RNA sequence: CGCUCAUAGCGACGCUGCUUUUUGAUCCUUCGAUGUCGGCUCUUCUUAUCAUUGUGAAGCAGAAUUCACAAAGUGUUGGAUUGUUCACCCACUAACAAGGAACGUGAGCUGGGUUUAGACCGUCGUGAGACAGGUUAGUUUUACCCUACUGUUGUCAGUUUGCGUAAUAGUAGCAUGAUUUAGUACGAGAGGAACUGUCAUGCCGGAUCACUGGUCUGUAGGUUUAUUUGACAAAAUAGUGACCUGCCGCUACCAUCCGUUGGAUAAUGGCUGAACGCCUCUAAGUCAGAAUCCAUUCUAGAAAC
RNA sequence: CUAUGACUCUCUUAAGGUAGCCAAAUGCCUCGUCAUCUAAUUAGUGACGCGCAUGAAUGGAUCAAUGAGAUUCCCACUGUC
């Protein structure tokens, strides 16, 4: 198992959405809510349901 | 060799030529391996060998029908271990009929594409 | 002229009458062909499709690219409460086919099995189904006729089927009509098959005895009824373009001027779903234990390398189902029908000896996240120690 | 506006045509696809037979037949089967629906024959395929005319690449070495195919013969003396330039 | 010595097996056992471990291990390292670096004394590679590279570059690294080097299409 | 002709046929009206077989190719130009075979063309006007009937119901690539296989909703626009105001699973063996054998039990 | 220089296509030929003109601005596919 990147959520097998960027950084999003909030470029410290909060 | 990845590059899809040989994009005109099925567009997944022309690049290679590898695509495919993956942009890299990349690949190369073709692994920096 | 561009046919014709299945639960219309080499055993069962989950396992296919590597595989959970055997029936071979011969019943018929005979059970005051029959066991001028009825079966006829029925009432759907079907016994020497019949009257048969572990079974069922559906979504027909007048979700041409009737092979709009279908080679990954009605929670979804005392049930239970509290069996891939539907499992028609029959499953993970959303937790206690 | 069967259509045909333009008008007739080179060589093909129709045409695509108002004015006659002979001899072969094919495929048959005759490369001279000069004749930018003769047209395409490149325009010579026993059925195959000199055959040693061959015919003769024999046979160069090839400029 | 070999007739054996000074890894090859022919040559020493890394068949130019440290990326599985750490006896510190900018075989060309570096290696990798390999690292690119691994093949007493490499790089790479150089290209169909040959102090498993006169050229710096 | 060699493959000079997928010929039906090109769509039939299966021949060493047979079970593509049928290219491919069905298919569509009325130009005509020349714009009506088909109730000629049998009808899996074989057989070399096994894919089929994506009247939660309720709060109206996230559900090679084995045959290769003291696969008998046929499994379950 | 056809005559019917322009909405052959756009173009555009059958208020050539006019292409954008 792994940990989500944007929020620091725990990711079990086959409940992720892995995304790899042009700068060769790879991100593991846990669902497309976290993916939407990553692609709007909001800080995780702004929202209050993440594990970075 | 390798499995079925989700095909999200049909015929007529431009993609960025991640290759230090002279192209700026690659326009996929057909995929090597597609047969049949009335009115279906030949799609390319990752790992596929495509017949492609360049619509933007060095003019000494610009109207030829050349061969390319799809090394990343942003249509999400699940590997069979359960994890999905999707890249940022569609991309390609020019080769010979055999599959010899003679240049250097830039950006991340999907590891469903460094499987079938050895020389796509030996010119990749990041294999993801 | 002719068909200009050649394309494969839209639809199978081996499924062609496409109507609603007359069997509410799935009919085994063919049983595995009997060999007298083997011992006596049943060959069918009746589960209920609880839900679906995904498991993680390490593949043991040598030569593949996934080999000794983890794979997320989806599995459906078929909950199999134990089946009561309640009679036996003989079948003599005739020139027109097998025919029902004498039908020996048992004595303590359950009040759930007797509900199949009764369409209006509540209006009936004295439920008089199988009451003059059970009084044959009281005297011995009637009990003598049971043995002379049974020696007719173990001499004159060739197929021995036990009339077996389930316990819907033990799992709470809303049903008390206990689903009943004949399971043909498949062993040598008919005087052993009727022996295995009468030595199982009023006793239950668990799914772990009929079906082994790591084996391929067939799943007979009735698919999800999607009602009167048009021809695209029923057959697969390419949509007509944006400009069409009368409608674009049609077969355009339904025939030439020259047969001069519409063929039975033209795609037409009609019923989807509630089709009787079987599915062969669905490998069982795990047969789960029963959970006790007096004792602790048996950790059914506990696997090796996981060590979490948890059920096969996810958080909040299976969606649109209860909890799996009786014996289950989880087999790879999907099966016909939704949740809460009776499935007739069946041992395979031929004995498979391929690769998947010789596969041995060792699950490492079973996902019990809440599939009523996107649960990021496994057990209900990890949730409370996570946001506490 | 909504007639139940639409009107007349074009007269598409498979039939050759000859032109004669007389007194201001353009007269053609329908003929055969090959039997008009069977008429202008002095050979007889039975004047009934050389025509697909005897009535004289204004336009052979429009299917328009002339009239005696504009025929006694033009030819000085009105008898059509004498008109059709003057149009046949004193005309020029015009071209049907397949004109673009029988001209483009003709000018792509011409470059695929006359350019490939006798041409060896630089650097210890060897022949090669046709597509190398199919590159290097568009590369010299040749425009092909047919009215100059084909041998003269052969002598014209190699003049430009003697001017441009370093290529040889003559025969060559080879010294074939073959063993005695397993090479005589290789001898009598090429002996009525090409010219020989210095036939020096032994019993104990190898048949050595010398050749009179063009420059281009060598690549066949390198392979045909192995694919018939089944063993090794030796190619030894004799001489690189002999006359009476195209060096006489016929 | 410098022997021809192919992986499923796609001759580039320099990626599907790494032949280091210890612990020759080999690819999976769900086929004929590819490791069996290399084990007929390495049953003496240098144990073959038949592990695949990251799911992918390449291990030679996806893991770039020395005698003193094997490297695996952040895509590798904990069970694959649980097999790799167990398949060889205790001499090494196998270190999974938390790099994800690159794939680790093509971006460091390693050696028992002094290794090479793809320029933007992100100095976290520099400190952890000086920890677990103990070798000097130089962020250099040859005239035919910016990815300095798998365009050059590094061993002890020998190395290789291309004939599309300038002399100015070869002289400084003999000066700084202190290893003699030949500009020969393995496997005359292609250009890259460490897809063709993997080198020990005893042998060099080399791709099958390689010409024998060039095999003599590269063996006259790999062997001696 | 094919080095020699008529018939491996062809085959002039002639002759004998078939086909109705070309165009003629004719005018038998239809002018109180059969909607006429092409394409899209969809089904079925044909074999004159392109590939696939089994075989036999070759100028079949291997590879590649060519001829024929049993074979129509299963496939037979994406595109640029053109209204096009046809044509001609580019690219994939196991192969991109030829065809019918009222030149299948306009109450199925489109209307590009043809084909009304407007108009332009060229040539012809004094002119009105002609063109079977080019261009441009130009209404595509009705099913609710009967049948056919697809489904759905319903009557069953001791009552109600249970569990079944399976007549008859349909029928589904086809095909490829890599690799082991093996750089081995074959070959002087160049090149370079085959059977079995393994792994994947293409197309089709049947399901499915654990994942991933889409959808969002769950008007679920939030942001927010204009107005209205005096302000806050909470509401509404703007036909669901818009946007963000999103259950359940439905869904997609955009995701997942699954898609068998026996008998008889054809082609042909044969055995025993006559006719015809010998020979002969054939005449009496007989053997193996095809993607075939029939069952198996699958779908329905009859004025059948 | 027999290619070009000045020149030279006759002929119907007075004269013999000047400057321009074009496979043009005008060109049969025709999917003309050369280049170009394309991977591939019966399309588009630029050139060539013995032009079936262009051409000077039957108006020729050009042409900014404008067009619910006709055609072709590149970018954006989309369920057109």
Tab-separated table of N, CA and C (backbone and C1' of nucleotides) in Angstrom, chain F residues 27-69:
chain	number	residue	atom	x	y	z
F	27	C	P	-39.886	-4.257	-80.838
F	27	C	O5'	-40.680	-4.323	-79.480
F	27	C	C5'	-41.548	-5.403	-79.180
F	27	C	C4'	-42.001	-5.348	-77.749
F	27	C	C3'	-43.006	-4.246	-77.442
F	27	C	O3'	-43.908	-4.680	-76.431
F	27	C	C1'	-41.058	-3.920	-76.154
F	28	C	P	-45.164	-5.596	-76.806
F	28	C	O5'	-44.820	-6.983	-76.117
F	28	C	C5'	-45.806	-7.976	-75.922
F	28	C	C4'	-45.785	-8.460	-74.502
F	28	C	C3'	-46.001	-7.391	-73.458
F	28	C	O3'	-47.359	-7.079	-73.278
F	28	C	C1'	-44.176	-8.728	-72.835
F	29	U	P	-47.761	-5.621	-72.795
F	29	U	O5'	-47.520	-5.684	-71.238
F	29	U	C5'	-48.333	-6.505	-70.431
F	29	U	C4'	-47.946	-6.404	-68.986
F	29	U	C3'	-48.027	-5.024	-68.390
F	29	U	O3'	-49.349	-4.703	-68.013
F	29	U	C1'	-46.019	-6.088	-67.727
F	30	U	P	-50.130	-3.516	-68.741
F	30	U	O5'	-49.614	-2.252	-67.964
F	30	U	C5'	-49.915	-2.129	-66.594
F	30	U	C4'	-48.805	-1.476	-65.822
F	30	U	C3'	-48.565	-0.019	-66.091
F	30	U	O3'	-49.524	0.793	-65.460
F	30	U	C1'	-46.511	-1.169	-65.858
F	31	C	P	-50.578	1.620	-66.326
F	31	C	O5'	-49.733	2.856	-66.819
F	31	C	C5'	-49.206	3.760	-65.870
F	31	C	C4'	-48.931	5.100	-66.484
F	31	C	C3'	-50.049	5.744	-67.278
F	31	C	O3'	-50.887	6.489	-66.413
F	31	C	C1'	-47.899	6.049	-68.323
F	32	G	P	-52.415	6.813	-66.759
F	32	G	O5'	-52.899	7.659	-65.515
F	32	G	C5'	-52.817	7.141	-64.206
F	32	G	C4'	-54.085	7.372	-63.435
F	32	G	C3'	-54.440	6.304	-62.426
F	32	G	O3'	-53.819	6.553	-61.182
F	32	G	C1'	-56.357	6.996	-63.671
F	33	A	P	-52.697	5.570	-60.602
F	33	A	O5'	-51.370	5.974	-61.365
F	33	A	C5'	-50.713	5.025	-62.191
F	33	A	C4'	-49.219	4.994	-61.994
F	33	A	C3'	-48.741	4.688	-60.587
F	33	A	O3'	-47.581	3.876	-60.671
F	33	A	C1'	-47.924	6.806	-61.276
F	34	U	P	-47.711	2.357	-61.160
F	34	U	O5'	-46.707	1.599	-60.201
F	34	U	C5'	-46.864	1.703	-58.802
F	34	U	C4'	-45.644	1.230	-58.071
F	34	U	C3'	-44.531	2.252	-57.891
F	34	U	O3'	-43.952	2.080	-56.608
F	34	U	C1'	-43.687	0.341	-58.960
F	35	G	P	-44.262	3.137	-55.450
F	35	G	O5'	-43.312	4.335	-55.821
F	35	G	C5'	-41.927	4.110	-55.917
F	35	G	C4'	-41.259	5.202	-56.688
F	35	G	C3'	-39.749	5.139	-56.727
F	35	G	O3'	-39.287	4.270	-57.741
F	35	G	C1'	-40.447	7.324	-56.177
F	36	U	P	-37.842	3.586	-57.654
F	36	U	O5'	-37.118	4.088	-58.968
F	36	U	C5'	-35.875	3.539	-59.363
F	36	U	C4'	-35.028	4.565	-60.062
F	36	U	C3'	-33.955	5.218	-59.215
F	36	U	O3'	-32.786	4.433	-59.136
F	36	U	C1'	-35.094	6.841	-60.523
F	37	C	P	-31.925	4.438	-57.795
F	37	C	O5'	-30.420	4.409	-58.299
F	37	C	C5'	-30.106	4.546	-59.672
F	37	C	C4'	-28.818	5.303	-59.852
F	37	C	C3'	-27.786	5.101	-58.763
F	37	C	O3'	-27.046	3.910	-58.893
F	37	C	C1'	-28.022	7.394	-59.167
F	38	G	P	-26.868	2.961	-57.620
F	38	G	O5'	-25.842	3.747	-56.701
F	38	G	C5'	-24.568	4.113	-57.192
F	38	G	C4'	-23.950	5.206	-56.362
F	38	G	C3'	-23.737	4.896	-54.904
F	38	G	O3'	-22.624	4.058	-54.686
F	38	G	C1'	-24.614	7.059	-55.111
F	39	G	P	-22.682	2.899	-53.585
F	39	G	O5'	-22.546	3.690	-52.221
F	39	G	C5'	-21.399	4.477	-51.962
F	39	G	C4'	-21.646	5.448	-50.841
F	39	G	C3'	-22.043	4.840	-49.514
F	39	G	O3'	-20.920	4.386	-48.782
F	39	G	C1'	-23.483	6.624	-50.019
F	40	C	P	-21.034	3.111	-47.822
F	40	C	O5'	-21.840	3.649	-46.569
F	40	C	C5'	-21.334	4.693	-45.758
F	40	C	C4'	-22.390	5.157	-44.799
F	40	C	C3'	-22.984	4.065	-43.938
F	40	C	O3'	-22.185	3.775	-42.807
F	40	C	C1'	-24.716	5.387	-44.860
F	41	U	P	-21.905	2.260	-42.383
F	41	U	O5'	-23.341	1.725	-42.000
F	41	U	C5'	-23.988	2.221	-40.842
F	41	U	C4'	-25.428	1.801	-40.788
F	41	U	C3'	-25.682	0.313	-40.735
F	41	U	O3'	-25.549	-0.194	-39.429
F	41	U	C1'	-27.140	1.326	-42.290
F	42	C	P	-24.630	-1.467	-39.130
F	42	C	O5'	-25.581	-2.691	-39.439
F	42	C	C5'	-26.767	-2.874	-38.695
F	42	C	C4'	-27.792	-3.638	-39.481
F	42	C	C3'	-27.351	-4.975	-40.022
F	42	C	O3'	-27.296	-6.003	-39.062
F	42	C	C1'	-28.491	-3.798	-41.705
F	43	U	P	-26.186	-7.141	-39.212
F	43	U	O5'	-26.980	-8.289	-39.930
F	43	U	C5'	-28.226	-8.677	-39.408
F	43	U	C4'	-29.096	-9.279	-40.466
F	43	U	C3'	-28.498	-10.410	-41.264
F	43	U	O3'	-28.448	-11.646	-40.582
F	43	U	C1'	-29.592	-8.935	-42.714
F	44	U	P	-27.314	-12.707	-40.968
F	44	U	O5'	-27.886	-13.437	-42.254
F	44	U	C5'	-29.151	-14.083	-42.247
F	44	U	C4'	-29.662	-14.277	-43.652
F	44	U	C3'	-28.756	-15.061	-44.580
F	44	U	O3'	-28.848	-16.463	-44.434
F	44	U	C1'	-29.404	-13.084	-45.655
F	45	C	P	-27.583	-17.365	-44.811
F	45	C	O5'	-27.599	-17.401	-46.395
F	45	C	C5'	-28.647	-18.050	-47.089
F	45	C	C4'	-28.675	-17.660	-48.541
F	45	C	C3'	-27.501	-18.105	-49.377
F	45	C	O3'	-27.559	-19.456	-49.772
F	45	C	C1'	-27.938	-15.865	-49.831
F	46	U	P	-26.194	-20.255	-49.983
F	46	U	O5'	-25.590	-19.646	-51.318
F	46	U	C5'	-26.255	-19.775	-52.567
F	46	U	C4'	-25.399	-19.237	-53.680
F	46	U	C3'	-23.992	-19.777	-53.705
F	46	U	O3'	-23.920	-21.044	-54.318
F	46	U	C1'	-23.945	-17.447	-54.022
F	47	U	P	-23.096	-22.208	-53.606
F	47	U	O5'	-21.842	-22.400	-54.560
F	47	U	C5'	-21.836	-21.807	-55.849
F	47	U	C4'	-20.512	-21.171	-56.194
F	47	U	C3'	-19.270	-21.942	-55.763
F	47	U	O3'	-18.334	-21.924	-56.822
F	47	U	C1'	-19.109	-19.705	-55.057
F	48	A	P	-17.619	-23.269	-57.302
F	48	A	O5'	-17.050	-22.848	-58.719
F	48	A	C5'	-17.389	-21.581	-59.261
F	48	A	C4'	-16.238	-20.607	-59.250
F	48	A	C3'	-16.187	-19.667	-58.054
F	48	A	O3'	-14.850	-19.212	-57.865
F	48	A	C1'	-16.605	-18.422	-59.997
F	49	U	P	-13.845	-19.983	-56.884
F	49	U	O5'	-13.863	-19.122	-55.552
F	49	U	C5'	-13.216	-17.859	-55.497
F	49	U	C4'	-12.181	-17.786	-54.398
F	49	U	C3'	-10.916	-18.613	-54.616
F	49	U	O3'	-9.807	-17.911	-54.085
F	49	U	C1'	-11.893	-19.204	-52.573
F	50	C	P	-8.903	-16.975	-55.014
F	50	C	O5'	-8.604	-15.734	-54.074
F	50	C	C5'	-7.322	-15.148	-54.024
F	50	C	C4'	-7.152	-14.343	-52.768
F	50	C	C3'	-6.848	-15.134	-51.516
F	50	C	O3'	-5.487	-15.499	-51.409
F	50	C	C1'	-8.529	-13.551	-51.060
F	51	A	P	-5.079	-16.859	-50.669
F	51	A	O5'	-5.368	-16.555	-49.143
F	51	A	C5'	-4.541	-15.663	-48.424
F	51	A	C4'	-5.122	-15.371	-47.069
F	51	A	C3'	-5.214	-16.551	-46.128
F	51	A	O3'	-3.986	-16.835	-45.486
F	51	A	C1'	-7.228	-15.322	-46.086
F	52	U	P	-3.575	-18.355	-45.210
F	52	U	O5'	-4.665	-18.843	-44.173
F	52	U	C5'	-4.626	-18.382	-42.836
F	52	U	C4'	-5.787	-18.911	-42.048
F	52	U	C3'	-5.929	-20.416	-42.039
F	52	U	O3'	-5.088	-21.014	-41.075
F	52	U	C1'	-8.023	-19.405	-42.448
F	53	U	P	-4.200	-22.294	-41.442
F	53	U	O5'	-5.247	-23.479	-41.373
F	53	U	C5'	-6.058	-23.662	-40.225
F	53	U	C4'	-6.930	-24.870	-40.388
F	53	U	C3'	-6.326	-25.981	-41.213
F	53	U	O3'	-5.397	-26.768	-40.498
F	53	U	C1'	-8.541	-25.611	-41.904
F	54	G	P	-4.091	-27.317	-41.243
F	54	G	O5'	-4.610	-28.632	-41.954
F	54	G	C5'	-5.352	-29.601	-41.237
F	54	G	C4'	-6.074	-30.515	-42.184
F	54	G	C3'	-5.208	-31.109	-43.263
F	54	G	O3'	-4.490	-32.219	-42.790
F	54	G	C1'	-7.218	-30.310	-44.208
F	55	U	P	-3.038	-32.493	-43.374
F	55	U	O5'	-3.343	-33.393	-44.629
F	55	U	C5'	-2.743	-33.069	-45.853
F	55	U	C4'	-3.615	-33.430	-47.011
F	55	U	C3'	-2.880	-33.396	-48.322
F	55	U	O3'	-2.145	-34.577	-48.539
F	55	U	C1'	-4.868	-32.174	-48.540
F	56	G	P	-0.581	-34.461	-48.827
F	56	G	O5'	-0.532	-34.575	-50.398
F	56	G	C5'	-1.447	-35.430	-51.039
F	56	G	C4'	-1.740	-34.982	-52.435
F	56	G	C3'	-0.582	-34.403	-53.200
F	56	G	O3'	0.326	-35.384	-53.639
F	56	G	C1'	-2.481	-33.096	-53.577
F	57	A	P	1.740	-34.937	-54.225
F	57	A	O5'	1.438	-34.699	-55.756
F	57	A	C5'	2.445	-34.167	-56.582
F	57	A	C4'	1.891	-33.194	-57.583
F	57	A	C3'	2.897	-32.199	-58.113
F	57	A	O3'	3.700	-32.741	-59.136
F	57	A	C1'	0.931	-31.073	-57.500
F	58	A	P	5.266	-32.916	-58.892
F	58	A	O5'	5.837	-31.457	-59.118
F	58	A	C5'	5.582	-30.782	-60.329
F	58	A	C4'	5.923	-29.317	-60.250
F	58	A	C3'	7.269	-28.917	-59.682
F	58	A	O3'	8.311	-29.132	-60.614
F	58	A	C1'	5.566	-27.389	-59.023
F	59	G	P	9.818	-29.407	-60.142
F	59	G	O5'	10.684	-28.327	-60.922
F	59	G	C5'	11.592	-27.471	-60.243
F	59	G	C4'	11.595	-26.112	-60.885
F	59	G	C3'	10.307	-25.331	-60.684
F	59	G	O3'	10.433	-24.449	-59.585
F	59	G	C1'	10.787	-25.532	-63.009
F	60	C	P	9.172	-23.692	-58.955
F	60	C	O5'	9.186	-24.143	-57.431
F	60	C	C5'	9.639	-25.432	-57.049
F	60	C	C4'	9.448	-25.652	-55.574
F	60	C	C3'	10.429	-26.584	-54.891
F	60	C	O3'	11.649	-25.939	-54.586
F	60	C	C1'	8.219	-27.018	-54.138
F	61	A	P	13.007	-26.380	-55.306
F	61	A	O5'	13.941	-26.838	-54.107
F	61	A	C5'	13.823	-28.144	-53.574
F	61	A	C4'	14.557	-28.286	-52.267
F	61	A	C3'	14.073	-27.411	-51.131
F	61	A	O3'	12.925	-27.922	-50.484
F	61	A	C1'	16.425	-27.335	-51.232
F	62	G	P	11.814	-26.922	-49.907
F	62	G	O5'	12.580	-26.093	-48.792
F	62	G	C5'	12.868	-26.668	-47.531
F	62	G	C4'	13.323	-25.622	-46.555
F	62	G	C3'	12.467	-24.371	-46.490
F	62	G	O3'	11.341	-24.513	-45.645
F	62	G	C1'	14.723	-23.755	-46.718
F	63	A	P	9.940	-23.870	-46.074
F	63	A	O5'	10.252	-22.315	-46.142
F	63	A	C5'	10.433	-21.554	-44.960
F	63	A	C4'	10.833	-20.140	-45.279
F	63	A	C3'	9.859	-19.381	-46.157
F	63	A	O3'	8.811	-18.797	-45.416
F	63	A	C1'	12.024	-19.170	-47.041
F	64	A	P	7.318	-18.900	-45.965
F	64	A	O5'	7.358	-18.047	-47.301
F	64	A	C5'	7.456	-16.636	-47.247
F	64	A	C4'	7.791	-16.064	-48.594
F	64	A	C3'	6.772	-16.296	-49.686
F	64	A	O3'	5.660	-15.428	-49.605
F	64	A	C1'	8.896	-16.806	-50.516
F	65	U	P	4.172	-16.015	-49.727
F	65	U	O5'	4.016	-16.354	-51.274
F	65	U	C5'	4.220	-15.353	-52.260
F	65	U	C4'	4.638	-15.941	-53.586
F	65	U	C3'	3.587	-16.723	-54.338
F	65	U	O3'	2.665	-15.887	-54.994
F	65	U	C1'	5.638	-17.882	-54.425
F	66	U	P	1.161	-16.381	-55.195
F	66	U	O5'	1.278	-17.490	-56.319
F	66	U	C5'	1.560	-17.134	-57.658
F	66	U	C4'	1.686	-18.359	-58.520
F	66	U	C3'	0.473	-19.272	-58.550
F	66	U	O3'	-0.521	-18.832	-59.453
F	66	U	C1'	2.416	-20.558	-58.210
F	67	C	P	-2.060	-19.198	-59.210
F	67	C	O5'	-2.143	-20.743	-59.570
F	67	C	C5'	-2.005	-21.180	-60.912
F	67	C	C4'	-2.239	-22.663	-61.045
F	67	C	C3'	-3.480	-23.214	-60.370
F	67	C	O3'	-4.671	-23.005	-61.093
F	67	C	C1'	-1.647	-24.589	-59.861
F	68	A	P	-6.036	-22.780	-60.291
F	68	A	O5'	-6.402	-24.218	-59.724
F	68	A	C5'	-6.755	-25.271	-60.604
F	68	A	C4'	-6.789	-26.603	-59.904
F	68	A	C3'	-7.865	-26.776	-58.856
F	68	A	O3'	-9.113	-27.101	-59.417
F	68	A	C1'	-5.823	-27.547	-58.005
F	69	C	P	-10.457	-26.704	-58.655
F	69	C	O5'	-10.583	-27.797	-57.509
F	69	C	C5'	-10.735	-29.165	-57.845
F	69	C	C4'	-10.529	-30.065	-56.658
F	69	C	C3'	-11.494	-29.892	-55.513
F	69	C	O3'	-12.741	-30.487	-55.764
F	69	C	C1'	-9.306	-30.140	-54.675
